[PDB]
Amino acid sequence: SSAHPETEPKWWKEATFYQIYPASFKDSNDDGWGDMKGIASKLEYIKELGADAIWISPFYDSPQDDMGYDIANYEKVWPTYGTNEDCFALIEKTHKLGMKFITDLVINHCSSEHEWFKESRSSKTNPKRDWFFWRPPKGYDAEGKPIPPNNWKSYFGGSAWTFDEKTQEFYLRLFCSTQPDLNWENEDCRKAIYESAVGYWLDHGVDGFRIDVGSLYSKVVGLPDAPVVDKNSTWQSSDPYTLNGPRIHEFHQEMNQFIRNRVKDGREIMTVGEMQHASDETKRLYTSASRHELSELFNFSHTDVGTSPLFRYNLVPFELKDWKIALAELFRYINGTDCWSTIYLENHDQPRSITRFGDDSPKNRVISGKLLSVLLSALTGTLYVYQGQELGQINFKNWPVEKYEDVEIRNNYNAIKEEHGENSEEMKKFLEAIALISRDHARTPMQWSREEPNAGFSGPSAKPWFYLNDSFREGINVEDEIKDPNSVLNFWKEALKFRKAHKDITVYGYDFEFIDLDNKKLFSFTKKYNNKTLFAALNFSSDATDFKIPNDDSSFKLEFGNYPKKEVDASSRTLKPWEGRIYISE
Ligand SMILES: OC[C@H]1O[C@H](O)[C@H](O)[C@@H](O)[C@@H]1O
């Protein structure tokens, strides 16, 4: 383990994080929105699950055009969620339970309602004009409409620019129209960002930051037109010119130094960057401890499987190997380095992992939910569990498009309607995809009980901000799952206990090797820690599946699995449907 600097323990390496989506976690005042007092009331539940730390999605003052990721004030809690004092009380309560607290750092862009943007947009001559990207039209079209400065596509569909009537210029917004990109080329802007979004929260005791689209801060000079890679799309991906740009490491080093110099009590701060996509070299430049940039990053390959690289909302076939390789992208690069990795299958931007990677049928949703827990329990990195994942939550079914709340759905729908027609093959493919892939499958209220109609998220007379998934009626809820010894919730409790008990090789294990990589059903691997070997055999199918343990001997003991502990034959070399097993040899 000495030739593996990645094994050096840190609180944030071995902490299991639980991600809370504040709108949807727990309402305490029957207004249909989750809130801070709601979260506070459920910290014990989170601790009892086995979480060591929480990450709360944005709770700052926001118009909610992107459900909190459009921030109007970094230094004020959104009143619907509570007051600043409620937040400080929440941080303290989390701490007094022995848990760490990270907040969402959203500084690629702010709300157009932020005072910085209100000033910037007021004239062409004000001191904050160049805190954002303003450009004149590229002339006007045959209809008299201004033409945007370039052909870039918004992440949510359509053009990445919005015209401002007052100053007669476009501003850049890679996300929704009211999320103008901050200009990191402006040093005054960077310093103001650090003071408000970072320093304020360090001063109030956060243990770290989850850094929203942290790979987008550096724009290639000139904001050039992107090459035409999609011939059936008016607008083009800006990635070559916005993703992992030439100053991105400079910026992350600067912010890292700011954090180090701002902390007052010498505490260890974790940063997890939502970096989206990166080569292994880029990952190393971000996460090597000696680089003083990020602690770790999220990489999207594993959550991209089954989607077109050209458009997330066009489905394509995939096989198990594709997902194996994509998952391994999170962690293989750290082997024998001072880097660190993340492990997750769910967040507020993703559909449910049982639906995507297991089998969400009534017959198989429990066992396959447990299989996913066995897999995650054994992988190297900082583990994240997303609200409802521990309940074995599944995608909602048969929702009309008009029921979806997400701006990502609304904007993409409108762009397709405009470009291709509402009644088109393009729209049909889109509608097919949203049923599997929409971020909204993560965002329905947390299911605390079987109580009609709001499942204990809010009182029965309240109208939740977004519709409940019908699955609460099928026993996917906290109250019912606590009482069922066979539940996914109770299984996740066991999985976290297992992972912690064997943390040297589960959290810090190295020399990961696939066994039978090509297998369409068997997901198998080994890991090492000194004299120890972990061997995983995981059957991602309803068919029984054979496996072999490399260098098999008597020393391999069955330590964890999802079939009943008293009924598993550890010597057997065929997995039952959806069966997973972790063996450890010392
Ligand atoms: O802030 C724009 C986007 O950034 C990140 O990808 C967030 O996780 C996502 O929810 C948001 O829409």
Ligand SMILES: [Ca+2]
């Ligand atoms: Ca509320």
